[PDB]
Amino acid sequence: MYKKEYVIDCKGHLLGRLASLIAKELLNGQRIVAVRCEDINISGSLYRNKLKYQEFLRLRTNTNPKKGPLHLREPSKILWRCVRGMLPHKTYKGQLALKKLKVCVGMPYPYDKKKKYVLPSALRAFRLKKHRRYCRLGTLSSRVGWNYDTLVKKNEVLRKQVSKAYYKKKVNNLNEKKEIKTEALNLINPEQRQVLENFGY
Amino acid sequence: VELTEEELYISKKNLLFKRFVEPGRLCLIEYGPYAGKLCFIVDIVTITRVIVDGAFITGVPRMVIPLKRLKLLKERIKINKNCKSGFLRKTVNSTKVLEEFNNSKLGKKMIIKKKRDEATDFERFQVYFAKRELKKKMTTIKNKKN
Amino acid sequence: KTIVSTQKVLIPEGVKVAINARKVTVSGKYGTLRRSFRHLPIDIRLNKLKKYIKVVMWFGVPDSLACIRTVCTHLKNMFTGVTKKFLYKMRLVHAHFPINSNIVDNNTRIEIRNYLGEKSVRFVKALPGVVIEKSPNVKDEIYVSGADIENVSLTAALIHQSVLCRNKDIRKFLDGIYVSEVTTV
Amino acid sequence: AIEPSLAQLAQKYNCQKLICRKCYARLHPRATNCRNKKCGRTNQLRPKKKL
Amino acid sequence: KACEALRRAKYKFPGRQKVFVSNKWGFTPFSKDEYQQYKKKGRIISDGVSCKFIREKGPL
Amino acid sequence: IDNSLNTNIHQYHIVGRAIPTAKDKNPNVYRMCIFAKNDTNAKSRFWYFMKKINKLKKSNGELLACEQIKERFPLRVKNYGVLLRYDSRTGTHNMYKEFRDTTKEGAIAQLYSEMAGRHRARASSINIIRISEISSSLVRRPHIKQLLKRRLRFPALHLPTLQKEYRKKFASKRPSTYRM
RNA sequence: UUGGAUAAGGUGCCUAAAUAUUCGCUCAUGAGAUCCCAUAAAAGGUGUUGGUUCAUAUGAACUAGCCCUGAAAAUGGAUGGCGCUAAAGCGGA
Numbered sequence: 001m002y003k004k005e006y007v008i009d010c011k012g013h014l015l016g017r018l019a020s021l022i023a024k025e026l027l028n029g030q031r032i033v034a035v036r037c038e039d040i041n042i043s044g045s046l047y048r049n050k051l052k053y054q055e056f057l058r059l060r061t062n063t064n065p066k067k068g069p070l071h072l073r074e075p076s077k078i079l080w081r082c083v084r085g086m087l088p089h090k091t092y093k094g095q096l097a098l099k100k101l102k103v104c105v106g107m108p109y110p111y112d113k114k115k116k117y118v119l120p121s122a123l124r125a126f127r128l129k130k131h132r133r134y135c136r137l138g139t140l141s142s143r144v145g146w147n148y149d150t151l152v153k154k155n156e157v158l159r160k161q162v163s164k165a166y167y168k169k170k171v172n173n174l175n176e177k178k179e180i181k182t183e184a185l186n187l188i189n190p191e192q193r194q195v196l197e198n199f200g201y
Numbered sequence: 202v203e204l205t206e207e208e209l210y211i212s213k214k215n216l217l218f219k220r221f222v223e224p225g226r227l228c229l230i231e232y233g234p235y236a237g238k239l240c241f242i243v244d245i246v247t248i249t250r251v252i253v254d255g256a257f258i259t260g261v262p263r264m265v266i267p268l269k270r271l272k273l274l275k276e277r278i279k280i281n282k283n284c285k286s287g288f289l290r291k292t293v294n295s296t297k298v299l300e301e302f303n304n305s306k307l308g309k310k311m312i313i314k315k316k317r318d319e320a321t322d323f324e325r326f327q328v329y330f331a332k333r334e335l336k337k338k339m340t341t342i343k344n345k346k347n
Numbered sequence: 348k349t350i351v352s353t354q355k356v357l358i359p360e361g362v363k364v365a366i367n368a369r370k371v372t373v374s375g376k377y378g379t380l381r382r383s384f385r386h387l388p389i390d391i392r393l394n395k396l397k398k399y400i401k402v403v404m405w406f407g408v409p410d411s412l413a414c415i416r417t418v419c420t421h422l423k424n425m426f427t428g429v430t431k432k433f434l435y436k437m438r439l440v441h442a443h444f445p446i447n448s449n450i451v452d453n454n455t456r457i458e459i460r461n462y463l464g465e466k467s468v469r470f471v472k473a474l475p476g477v478v479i480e481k482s483p484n485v486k487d488e489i490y491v492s493g494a495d496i497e498n499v500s501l502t503a504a505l506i507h508q509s510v511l512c513r514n515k516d517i518r519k520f521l522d523g524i525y526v527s528e529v530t531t532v
Numbered sequence: 533a534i535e536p537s538l539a540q541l542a543q544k545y546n547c548q549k550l551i552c553r554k555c556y557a558r559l560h561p562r563a564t565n566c567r568n569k570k571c572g573r574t575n576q577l578r579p580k581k582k583l
Numbered sequence: 584k585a586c587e588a589l590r591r592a593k594y595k596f597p598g599r600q601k602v603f604v605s606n607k608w609g610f611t612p613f614s615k616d617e618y619q620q621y622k623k624k625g626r627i628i629s630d631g632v633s634c635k636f637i638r639e640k641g642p643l
Numbered sequence: 644i645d646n647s648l649n650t651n652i653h654q655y656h657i658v659g660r661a662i663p664t665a666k667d668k669n670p671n672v673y674r675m676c677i678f679a680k681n682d683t684n685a686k687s688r689f690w691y692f693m694k695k696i697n698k699l700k701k702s703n704g705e706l707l708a709c710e711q712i713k714e715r716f717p718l719r720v721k722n723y724g725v726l727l728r729y730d731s732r733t734g735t736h737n738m739y740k741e742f743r744d745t746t747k748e749g750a751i752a753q754l755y756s757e758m759a760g761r762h763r764a765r766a767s768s769i770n771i772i773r774i775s776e777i778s779s780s781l782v783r784r785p786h787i788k789q790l791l792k793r794r795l796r797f798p799a800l801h802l803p804t805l806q807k808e809y810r811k812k813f814a815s816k817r818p819s820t821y822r823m
Numbered sequence: 824u825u826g827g828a829u830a831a832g833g834u835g836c837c838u839a840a841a842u843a844u845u846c847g848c849u850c851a852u853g854a855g856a857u858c859c860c861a862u863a864a865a866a867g868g869u870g871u872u873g874g875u876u877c878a879u880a881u882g883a884a885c886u887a888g889c890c891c892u893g894a895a896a897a898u899g900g901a902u903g904g905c906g907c908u909a910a911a912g913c914g915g916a
């Protein structure tokens with residue numbers, strides 16, 4: 001957490017754990033961009049999750065619902081809320097930490113060209129037994145009225161093509177570099193070359 | 202009775218689970234006082250615990266471990282179930298399995314890492330210099346290509 | 348926990364079986380069927396040189412074994428479908444008013460008219476890739492057919508639902524379409 | 533006008549079942565338990581009343 | 584049948600009860616086998632429900 | 644030597660006898676193996692058992708011998724049969740369980756965990772009545788029988804337990820549980 | 824006052840300290856979460872997990888763990904919150 005800004009790819013993660021991971025980092029002093037928040041997984045069965053959400057929604061302020069619990073139903077929003085929950089947001093430091101976090105659905109403008117990081121101690125594949133029921137967050141959101149899910153998916157798909165295109169180019173570049181290295185290893189100095197070989201490069 | 206051409210099929214039939222925990226599997230201990238160390242599966246205690254032995258080439262004594270603390274390598278050497286440590290040592294040396302492991306990508310990378318760890322400052326500097334030289338040469342080549 | 352549990356599913360003669368990651372795809376005489384199994388931990392494998400496919404499950408309680416068995420059964424069903432269409436015979440029994448069954452839109456969308464004499468039209472559309480035919484032998488029965496053992500069954504169920512009456516004695520009013528025979532073409 | 537075989541078939545579905553003595557669920561005629569969670573899967577089953 | 588009856592009865596007591604079949608002969612404080620043995624050597628006199636065991640103690 | 648894996652249950656042979664009295668010059672000596680964490684605990688256990696069985700209490704007897712028995716072949720897999728007496732919240736039960744292990748002590752340790760986990764039986768409530776090595780022809784429990792298989796082989800589906808050095812919260816590329 | 828080392832308790836984050844290790848057990852369409860303490864019962868359960876006693880690898884009967892039912896009140900809502908299921912639950916070591 002000594003980087004300028006960590007971009008976290010939220011696909012295949014387990015919600016609460018991910019949030020927890022984020023929160024500590026934020027507290028420490030790290031700018032976090034939680035990206036691709038539609039594919040965050042919850043450890044409960046989908047129906048159960050939905051029920052829970054419904055229950056949460058039901059707890060509103062009786063006198064004037066303009067105040068009280070704002071039931072933000074965007075997956076990113078939900079994630080943000082979760083993060084906040086795990087923070088001392090009522091102080092100043094906590095507030096600052098919260099501010100530092102930025103959440104995104106899918107991938108927007110700058111966070112497509114930035115390196116996407118994964119939290120391995122929070123992954124669904126590493127935290128759930130494969131005979132247990134899990135729930136995609138996007139789906140849950142859709143169920144409790146988010147609407148912009150299909151659109152998001154489409155956008156993601158579109159982005160994927162672009163990424164693939166870029167990836168091909170990158171691969172080509174890498175290959176070229178390798179070739180160059182191969183060529184030039186004979187053009188250096190013997191002892192130096194040997195040394196290089198010894199140290200892996 | 203022979204297979205004639207079915208043998209080939211058997212050889213090249215994709216199996217999802219390569220590397221089984223079984224007697225004579227190589228094994229890299231990941232967690233504990235011993236880590237990064239190699240050690241062979243002698244017997245197996247239960248569904249979770251196994252007895253390993255790092256043949257006196259390696260530093261790790263015969264001991265029980267949780268399988269969870271082991272990462273199976275692609276290497277195996279056929280051994281009798283009740284094989285004692287001396288026998289294991291004899292066999293592995295004969296088969297040159299350690300050499301094979303070293304040759305393999307993972308082993309190579311491990312060794313590289315070790316080298317990096319153990320290097321003197323000067324050696325690091327030498328490496329840097331070499332890299333710089335390569336870059337220069339590489340850059341020149343790139344320019345030429347352009 | 349049981350270390351190794353296996354099930355052998357013998358493939359028929361004229362079946363093109365193709366698996367990858369529990370996503371099984373079978374091609375035959377009466378269409379192609381694709382059905383994923385990536386919701387249980389199973390390393391199902393092909394044997395293209397000979398016959399059969401082997402479903403194996405490592406560790407896991409009796410639940411796991413049960414799951415494996417189910418998977419095997421499903422596979423078998425699929426194979427059967429590919430070889431030969433799954434024929435679901437559905438006989439409609441009426442006490443007074445004859446049930447008017449009308450097939451349209453390429454043997455899909457079976458329209459049920461004049462059930463118990465309500466003068467309304469009951470619409471029930473078949474699932475993807477399932478043909479609904481009428482009687483060539485007797486007078487009442489309706490054939491629900493088309494490769495997938497599951498889809499056809501579902502369609503049949505839907506049809507039944509569409510038929511069945513509401514707030515009256517069900518033991519007296521036996522009116523409706525019912526699955527007579529589960530067979531193959 | 534219900535020909536005997538057809539009638540029998542109809543019965544097979546509509547009549548020859550069991551019923552939960554607790555939540556009234558229609559069960560298969562050979563069931564040992566309720567299957568429904570609300571009765572807590574009771575074994576208290578009765579046959580569907582005929583006529 | 585007896586066990587069943589007991590169980591039925593239990594449904595009416597409060598708290599936790601348990602039906603317990605005994606190795607005794609019946610109300611008498613002797614194991615079945617023991618009782619049989621006693622009968623064989625005639626060291627036991629049966630009255631009504633309860634039975635007395637000859638202890639080798641009284642006068643002739 | 645590993646200090647995270649070890650379970651500190653040892654086996655102690657204890658011998659003790661009631662103090663001799665003018666009226667009972669030649670008392671009876673009692674011996675037992677006791678599975679306990681330290682020597683003092685073992686002694687205590689022995690005393691308790693004496694109390695339970697005979698008329699004897701620590702106050703009117705003396706420990707004659709305490710040995711501490713180490714496994715003779717601590718690297719030979721063995722199939723252990725165990726007999727237990729345990730107390731539930733509802734009453735008392737006898738039971739027999741089997742554990743495949745490398746030492747008696749290890750087996751005992753396993754057993755304690757099992758009882759804790761499966762029956763919620765706490766260490767206090769259990770009395771080990773006999774552990775003996777069972778030949779493979781007399782294995783009655785399926786989870787041990789299976790192991791006793793001929794050329795036994797299984798894959799490794801367990802999740803990697805990385806060292807808290809190479810454990811990092813930020814990862815480059817999504818790790819793989821598949822391995823091989 | 825300074826430094827140390829603990830106690831009760833904890834160690835996912837809030838929250839200082841383990842997403843520690845180790846062996847089990849739990850999936851809940853109103854889970855569970857630690858003295859006092861802020862509740863739950865009789866009775867069930869072909870849910871699963873162990874057992875015991877019997878009979879001829881099935882059929883019984885039981886038994887106890889967890890889990891489910893039994894389980895309904897009024898502002899909205901409270902294992903303290905967020906959350907958590909290869910637990911961050913329960914029982915251990």
Ligand SMILES: O[C@H](c1cc(C(F)(F)F)nc2c(C(F)(F)F)cccc12)[C@@H]1CCCCN1
Binds near residue numbers: 015078
């Ligand atoms: O903490 C639960 C909960 C809340 C919220 C949130 F507030 F973010 F919408 N989301 C939950 C989710 C979510 F849908 F994954 F976000 C799952 C399970 C419980 C949730 C609720 C809160 C009221 C009482 C218990 N259920």
Ligand SMILES: [Mg+2]
């Ligand atoms: Mg101080």
Ligand SMILES: [Mg+2]
């Ligand atoms: Mg300290």
Ligand SMILES: [Mg+2]
Binds near residue numbers: 839
């Ligand atoms: Mg902290």
Ligand SMILES: [Mg+2]
Binds near residue numbers: 042906
């Ligand atoms: Mg939640």
Ligand SMILES: [Mg+2]
């Ligand atoms: Mg806590």
